[PDB]
Amino acid sequence: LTEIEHLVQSVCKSYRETCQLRLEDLLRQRSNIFSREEVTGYQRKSMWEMWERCAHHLTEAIQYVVEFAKRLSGFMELCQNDQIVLLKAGAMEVVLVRMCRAYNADNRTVFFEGKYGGMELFRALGCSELISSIFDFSHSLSALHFSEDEIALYTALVLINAHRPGLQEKRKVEQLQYNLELAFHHHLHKTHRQSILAKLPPKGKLRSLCSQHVERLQIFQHLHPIVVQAAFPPLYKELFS
Numbered sequence: 001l002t003e004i005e006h007l008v009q010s011v012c013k014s015y016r017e018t019c020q021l022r023l024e025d026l027l028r029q030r031s032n033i034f035s036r037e038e039v040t041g042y043q044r045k046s047m048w049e050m051w052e053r054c055a056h057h058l059t060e061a062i063q064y065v066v067e068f069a070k071r072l073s074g075f076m077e078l079c080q081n082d083q084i085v086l087l088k089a090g091a092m093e094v095v096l097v098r099m100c101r102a103y104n105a106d107n108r109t110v111f112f113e114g115k116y117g118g119m120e121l122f123r124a125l126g127c128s129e130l131i132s133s134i135f136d137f138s139h140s141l142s143a144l145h146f147s148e149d150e151i152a153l154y155t156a157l158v159l160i161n162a163h164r165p166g167l168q169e170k171r172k173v174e175q176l177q178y179n180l181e182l183a184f185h186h187h188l189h190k191t192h193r194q195s196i197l198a199k200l201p202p203k204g205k206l207r208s209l210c211s212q213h214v215e216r217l218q219i220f221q222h223l224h225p226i227v228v229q230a231a232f233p234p235l236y237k238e239l240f241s
């Protein structure tokens, strides 16, 4: 009935529609783990072939997040500068949070190209510290056993943050932020899940991992550029020069 319960439903609708795999598909496929021969197959690939595979999965993942953001009540109504500011700082942070759904804490593997594989699968990329940091972040997030609605509401808040440097209409973003915080806290009370609030990762940690990740992606993109058919061209122009 309330404007808030309608917001909860729409955020969860936007989320469910902008998700590539459904949680049950990822959950059932946990048994389908890459063989040592398949692992060796991936480790023996060139850095540049592994970069191409990962770059295209990450760009497709960002594209689903841009679509998620576009479907968030109020986003399209913000100025284009603000829309860029929010997506530039937050789209990859959302991708990093969404990744915990495809992560298995039991064996420390991620669902990649049809099967579950460990971080060793990525050996050829030569950025083990970064990749270990990503798996660690997914490991901490997997302990929360986040529900699909919780991930939807939390990621909307990762994106709609009025504290991002460069916002031109801070107040309009704050209004959207306040409504989403109410939606999230209202839903956690209703479901007796307010306990996750003290367990969420510190804001600086997600920011920090994201900045390290995007910085590496930028280094690879400079060395071996991939072209992408941009869903949001003004955002695309801010990262792809």
Ligand SMILES: O=C(O)c1cc(F)c(-c2nn(C(=O)c3c(Cl)cccc3C(F)(F)F)c3cccnc23)cc1O
Pocket (backbone or CB within 6 Å): 055, 056, 058, 059, 060, 062, 063, 066, 087, 088, 089, 091, 092, 214, 217, 218, 219, 221, 226, 228, 229, 230, 231, 232, 233, 234, 235, 236, 237, 239, 240
């Ligand atoms: O409009 C689009 O279709 C669009 C696609 C994108 F993938 C991003 C995107 N890629 N990306 C990358 O880090 C990236 C990715 Cl995901 C793959 C390779 C290189 C890059 C890096 F470094 F060159 F930009 C981002 C980081 C934050 C925020 N957005 C992005 C942005 C877009 O506007």
